[PDB]
């Protein structure tokens, strides 16, 4: 399966995906890295890995649909089969999400359905949970319907901050995101016709 990774920042998840997809048994190949922010470290990791990069600036488009539509053109150009959102901090429009339904994965730093949204770690610390984690899920129009592929629990330790908690969670992200990509790319996991996860 041909995979595009969309990023917005450091790209530690991108690096984990690169490392895994280069393994001989990987059913996925990363053929393009797309960032909405220039000069982000994720672009360097891609270039070090010899992966084509494309910066698409959301701030240069008349609206989201024209911005998403720009991304979709790159995806078609590279004949992409699966889209991995790895730190992509730009909400995608309904028609784009509709087109790539069942083919777009996202990593979220919480045990969904808990702590949806942009500051999951802050929410988890404010709430006082002692167990958090991360989630790889199919991207749906409303984040409340995205089917879950893999999760991993991560302990919240006394005195944790966003810095220390996010660091611990990212170690789990770097495990379940490559595993989830491998599950989808191999056809072992798919969005069944009923809309729920289907294990083949
Ligand atoms: N339809 C759908 N689309 C997308 C795109 C990524 N994802 C994966 C979920 C990612 C969690 C997330 C990410 C970003 C924001 C956010 O606030 N974005 C601002 C700009 C942010 C900035 O300035 O850094 C904006 O784009 O307006 C947020 F609220 C929650 C999804 C998804 O799950 N569904
Ligand atoms: N779902 C939105 C969200 O909170 N995304 C989070 O951004 C980070 C990017 O890390 P990276 O750029 O080092 O991979 C990840 O920890 C990911 O869970």
- 3-class DSSP state for residue 38? coil
Active site residue 108: yes
* Preceding amide of 158 cis, omega within 30: no
Resolution in A: 2.1
How far is ligand 1, taken at its centre, from the CA of residue 144, in Å? Answer: 13
The backbone torsions φ and ψ at residue 195, rounded to the nearest 5 degrees and listed phi first, read 90, -10
Do the Cβ atoms of 80 and 58 come closer than 8 Å? no
Experimental method: X-ray
Return the SS3 of 54.
Answer: strand
Residue 90 and residue 36: Cα distance in Å, rounded?
Answer: 8
One-character DSSP codes across 150-186: EEEEEEPPTT--HHHHHHHHHHHHHHHHHHHHHHHHT
Q: How far apart are CA 19 and CA 128, in angstroms?
A: 34
Residue 60 near residue 84 (C-beta atoms within 8 A): no
Pocket of ligand 1 (CB under 6 A): 85, 88-92, 97, 106, 117-118, 139, 141, 143, 146
Q: At what angle do helices 12-21 and 162-185 cross, to 10 degrees?
A: 30
On whether 90 is known to bind a ligand per the annotation, the reply is yes
Angle formed at CA 41 by CA 35 and CA 42, multiple of 5 degrees: 45
Q: If you count them, how many residues does the chain have?
A: 200
């Amino acid at each position: 399966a041909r995979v595009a990774v969309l990023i917005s920042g450091t790209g530690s998840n991108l690096q984990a995906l690169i490392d895994s997809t280069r393994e001989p048994n990987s059913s996925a190949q990363i053929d393009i890295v797309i960032s909405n922010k220039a000069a982000v470290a994720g672009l360097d990791k891609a270039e070090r890995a010899g992966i084509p990069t494309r910066v698409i600036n959301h701030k240069l488009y008349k609206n989201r649909v024209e911005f998403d539509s720009a991304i979709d053109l790159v995806l078609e150009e590279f004949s992409i089969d699966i889209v991995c959102l790895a730190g992509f901090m730009r909400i995608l429009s309904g028609p784009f999400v509709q087109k790539w339904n069942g083919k777009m994965l996202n990593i979220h730093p919480s045990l969904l359905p808990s702590f949806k949204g942009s500051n999951a770690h802050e929410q988890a610390l404010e709430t006082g949970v002692t167990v958090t984690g991360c989630t790889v899920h199919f991207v749906a129009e409303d984040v409340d319907a995205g089917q879950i592929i893999l999760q991993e629990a991560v302990p919240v330790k006394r005195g944790d901050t966003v810095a220390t908690l996010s660091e611990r969670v990212k170690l789990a992200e770097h495990k379940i995101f490559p595993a989830a990509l491998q599950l989808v790319a191999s056809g072992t996991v798919q969005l069944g016709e009923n809309g729920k996860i289907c294990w083949v």
